[PDB]
A and B are shown apart, each in its own frame.
Chain A
Amino acid sequence: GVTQTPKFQVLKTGQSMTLQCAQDMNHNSMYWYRQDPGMGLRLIYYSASEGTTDKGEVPNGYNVSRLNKREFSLRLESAAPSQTSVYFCASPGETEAFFGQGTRLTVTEDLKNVFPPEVAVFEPSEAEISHTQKATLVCLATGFYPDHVELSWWVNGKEVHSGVCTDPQPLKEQPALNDSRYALSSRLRVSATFWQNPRNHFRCQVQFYGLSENDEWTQDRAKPVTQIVSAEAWGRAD
């Protein structure tokens, strides 16, 4: 199928970058899309052949290059905040579109806006335990920017998907602000006897995708690099 890199990218406004896309299926056609809430997928540029490149729905702010049959690169020149999107490349065949993994790109005004999440676990209400014979743990990942995060629950060193619910979309801490920090909540529901067992260890892990070692950092605070932030709780006899 299609090989597309990178998966995550933080970019400073005015910076320039090139997204990669390669296919070994010997296809003639290669397409570049951007996905935005309520817009679905929108074609930026497409290439009908090796020496050809043609404009799509939204070509403004981008340039493409079809060198050989395999590669279809997408160039962002002087990256703008409006270019904060999910990018997908496709090379359709006689069967399917063949989509690459997807590039989640964030264009920031200043690196000063990049923050990792603050992660905190909130222990079950005894009032819930008494009323329902169930115990919901809540995890809050707050103040993160960009919204590139992966939340997971770990019970006794093993990742659980049972009794877990994570919000499908994060919340804007200041919706009217454009570089707003994000917040995400997740719940882990367990039985009262499982929560009451002190042997039981519950960990909420948030993988944050931020700045690389290569990025410049001029601020006093810690460099907001790609990192894991966690919070934990053990079962209480109480």
Chain B
Amino acid sequence: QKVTQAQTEISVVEKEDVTLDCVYETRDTTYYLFWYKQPPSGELVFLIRRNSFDEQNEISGRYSWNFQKSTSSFNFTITASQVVDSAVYFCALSGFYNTDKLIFGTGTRLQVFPNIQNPDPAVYQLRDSKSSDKSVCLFTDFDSQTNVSQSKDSDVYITDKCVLDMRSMDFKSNSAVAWSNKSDFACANAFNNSIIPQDTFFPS
């Protein structure tokens, strides 16, 4: 018995479709599979149960599964992608009896990103906290295709690209944070180990 989710991490553009793959291996003639959702909260959320003998392929809102008993594949498609889909997705396989083991795949982390045809990349210095020794740099308004890299300096901390949505003002944006106590640390050098647009706004 075996369940395989090849994809470790997948990204998707908001309002577009994505497919998560699952390939299983079993000696059982009759078995059942599951798709579980794990949102950032950490809870395991039931999505679907499909028995081996089931022919009736399902659609449930923006979710649609494709069970192919021939190619031993149970692939999950998410259409018109929304930020709420950003989670880890697990595929599972079990036999029908009490002595049987329910087995899971390694999962697939999906991240949905806004479609930014016109980014306004900039690096901003935030006002220091009276209670802190660190200087904070915000890299924001970049394209969803921007890859944020960790700093070469071990005393410089860089977070990954994060999606925020200001619902009223109807505006979605990407941001990464860089901070440090190091004397040579500045907004201009903070993301030097990352590939950023040449037009990146650097105020004073």
Contact = CB atoms under 8 A, between A and B. Distances in A.
| Contact present between A and B (CB < 8 A) | yes
A153 to B, nearest CB: 11
A140 interface: yes
Q: How large is the interface on B (under 10, 10 to 19, 20 to 34, 35 or more residues)?
A: 35 or more
A96 B49 contact: yes
A191 B157 contact: no
A41 B160 contact: no
Contacts, number: 151
A88 B162 contact: no
B104 A33 contact: yes
Closest 10 CB pairs of A and B: A127-B203, A122-B126, A125-B124, A165-B164, A123-B127, A163-B166, A120-B129, A41-B104, A40-B106, A28-B98
Contacts of B44: 88, 97, 99, 102
Interface string A151-173: 00000000000111111110101
Contact of B162 (A39, A56, A162, A167): A167
Given A40-B107, A187-B175, A128 B5 contact: no
Interface in B138-181: 138, 140-141, 154, 157-160, 162-169, 171, 173, 175, 177, 179
Interface stretch (A76-84, A130-138, A210-218): A130-138
A185 B107 CA distance: 25
Contact of B177 (A88, A96, A138): A138
A225 interface: no
Interface string B33-51: 0101000101110100100
B128 interface: yes
23 contacts: A33-B104, A38-B8, A40-B105, A49-B98, A95-B49, A96-B46, A99-B43, A102-B43, A120-B129, A122-B128, A127-B125, A127-B204, A128-B122, A131-B122, A138-B136, A140-B177, A163-B164, A165-B162, A166-B40, A166-B162, A167-B160, A169-B160, A187-B162
A111 interface: no
Given A97-B36, A136-B138, A191 B201 contact: no
Interface of B: 5, 8, 34, 36, 40, 42-44, 46, 49, 86, 90, 92, 94, 98-107, 120, 122, 124-129, 131-132, 134, 136, 138, 140-141, 154, 157-160, 162-169, 171, 173, 175, 177, 179, 201, 203-204
